[PDB]
């Protein structure tokens, strides 16, 4: 099989199946099930609770600078339901542990391809 950059973005950052984090253990479960903690704990990761179509649409919205200075980033006009997963103080690989926090923010993504879709999650603002 093959995984594209766009598909990896979906695996790492999309969860359209819920309107918001579904439990206090959501991040522990998702960071594991989406294979985001294989070799080390990832300190922060955001999941977006919106339709794929609505997130892909961001690539036709507000062009902004990525934090690294690249100019292929785009900010959403809409405010989106997101979950931020962040390591707790006691998290220690291979037993990675996360606090699940709900938010409603704009997202900033990097985009590529035809169709022109997200390949990178840059920030929420
Ligand atoms: O609000 C944020 C900021 C960063 N990241 C993620 O944290 C990592 C380092 O910045 C990135 O993961 P990556 O290298 O696989 O693309 C980025 O997507 C988030 O998930 N949410």
JSON list of C-alpha atoms in Angstrom, two decimals, residues 14-61:
[
{"chain": "A", "resi": 14, "resn": "UNK", "atom": "CA", "xyz": [-8.77, 14.55, 11.28]},
{"chain": "A", "resi": 15, "resn": "UNK", "atom": "CA", "xyz": [-11.58, 13.03, 13.30]},
{"chain": "A", "resi": 16, "resn": "UNK", "atom": "CA", "xyz": [-14.91, 13.73, 11.61]},
{"chain": "A", "resi": 17, "resn": "UNK", "atom": "CA", "xyz": [-16.69, 10.96, 13.57]},
{"chain": "A", "resi": 18, "resn": "UNK", "atom": "CA", "xyz": [-17.31, 13.07, 16.67]},
{"chain": "A", "resi": 19, "resn": "UNK", "atom": "CA", "xyz": [-18.31, 16.69, 17.29]},
{"chain": "A", "resi": 20, "resn": "UNK", "atom": "CA", "xyz": [-15.70, 17.02, 20.02]},
{"chain": "A", "resi": 21, "resn": "UNK", "atom": "CA", "xyz": [-13.36, 14.85, 22.13]},
{"chain": "A", "resi": 22, "resn": "UNK", "atom": "CA", "xyz": [-15.55, 12.00, 23.31]},
{"chain": "A", "resi": 23, "resn": "UNK", "atom": "CA", "xyz": [-13.89, 11.25, 26.67]},
{"chain": "A", "resi": 24, "resn": "UNK", "atom": "CA", "xyz": [-11.10, 12.34, 28.96]},
{"chain": "A", "resi": 25, "resn": "UNK", "atom": "CA", "xyz": [-9.06, 9.42, 27.57]},
{"chain": "A", "resi": 26, "resn": "UNK", "atom": "CA", "xyz": [-9.63, 10.48, 23.94]},
{"chain": "A", "resi": 27, "resn": "UNK", "atom": "CA", "xyz": [-6.09, 11.68, 23.36]},
{"chain": "A", "resi": 28, "resn": "UNK", "atom": "CA", "xyz": [-4.43, 8.65, 24.95]},
{"chain": "A", "resi": 29, "resn": "UNK", "atom": "CA", "xyz": [-6.54, 6.41, 22.73]},
{"chain": "A", "resi": 30, "resn": "UNK", "atom": "CA", "xyz": [-6.16, 8.41, 19.50]},
{"chain": "A", "resi": 31, "resn": "UNK", "atom": "CA", "xyz": [-2.43, 9.09, 19.77]},
{"chain": "A", "resi": 32, "resn": "UNK", "atom": "CA", "xyz": [-1.98, 5.32, 19.98]},
{"chain": "A", "resi": 33, "resn": "UNK", "atom": "CA", "xyz": [-4.55, 4.22, 17.42]},
{"chain": "A", "resi": 34, "resn": "UNK", "atom": "CA", "xyz": [-3.41, 6.72, 14.76]},
{"chain": "A", "resi": 35, "resn": "UNK", "atom": "CA", "xyz": [0.20, 5.56, 15.24]},
{"chain": "A", "resi": 36, "resn": "UNK", "atom": "CA", "xyz": [1.60, 8.90, 16.39]},
{"chain": "A", "resi": 37, "resn": "UNK", "atom": "CA", "xyz": [3.80, 7.61, 19.24]},
{"chain": "A", "resi": 38, "resn": "UNK", "atom": "CA", "xyz": [5.84, 4.83, 17.61]},
{"chain": "A", "resi": 39, "resn": "UNK", "atom": "CA", "xyz": [9.40, 5.95, 18.46]},
{"chain": "A", "resi": 40, "resn": "UNK", "atom": "CA", "xyz": [8.87, 8.85, 20.86]},
{"chain": "A", "resi": 41, "resn": "UNK", "atom": "CA", "xyz": [6.02, 10.74, 22.50]},
{"chain": "A", "resi": 42, "resn": "UNK", "atom": "CA", "xyz": [4.74, 13.59, 20.38]},
{"chain": "A", "resi": 43, "resn": "UNK", "atom": "CA", "xyz": [4.47, 16.62, 22.71]},
{"chain": "A", "resi": 44, "resn": "UNK", "atom": "CA", "xyz": [1.39, 18.16, 21.05]},
{"chain": "A", "resi": 45, "resn": "UNK", "atom": "CA", "xyz": [-1.06, 17.05, 18.41]},
{"chain": "A", "resi": 46, "resn": "UNK", "atom": "CA", "xyz": [-4.34, 18.56, 17.22]},
{"chain": "A", "resi": 47, "resn": "UNK", "atom": "CA", "xyz": [-7.37, 16.68, 15.92]},
{"chain": "A", "resi": 48, "resn": "UNK", "atom": "CA", "xyz": [-10.07, 18.50, 13.95]},
{"chain": "A", "resi": 49, "resn": "UNK", "atom": "CA", "xyz": [-13.73, 17.59, 14.41]},
{"chain": "A", "resi": 50, "resn": "UNK", "atom": "CA", "xyz": [-15.15, 18.85, 11.13]},
{"chain": "A", "resi": 51, "resn": "UNK", "atom": "CA", "xyz": [-16.01, 17.27, 7.82]},
{"chain": "A", "resi": 52, "resn": "UNK", "atom": "CA", "xyz": [-13.13, 16.47, 5.50]},
{"chain": "A", "resi": 53, "resn": "UNK", "atom": "CA", "xyz": [-14.70, 18.74, 2.86]},
{"chain": "A", "resi": 54, "resn": "UNK", "atom": "CA", "xyz": [-14.76, 21.68, 5.29]},
{"chain": "A", "resi": 55, "resn": "UNK", "atom": "CA", "xyz": [-11.11, 21.21, 6.29]},
{"chain": "A", "resi": 56, "resn": "UNK", "atom": "CA", "xyz": [-9.97, 20.72, 2.66]},
{"chain": "A", "resi": 57, "resn": "UNK", "atom": "CA", "xyz": [-11.75, 23.94, 1.79]},
{"chain": "A", "resi": 58, "resn": "UNK", "atom": "CA", "xyz": [-9.29, 25.85, 3.99]},
{"chain": "A", "resi": 59, "resn": "UNK", "atom": "CA", "xyz": [-6.73, 25.51, 1.17]},
{"chain": "A", "resi": 60, "resn": "UNK", "atom": "CA", "xyz": [-8.82, 28.05, -0.79]},
{"chain": "A", "resi": 61, "resn": "UNK", "atom": "CA", "xyz": [-9.12, 30.51, 2.12]}
]
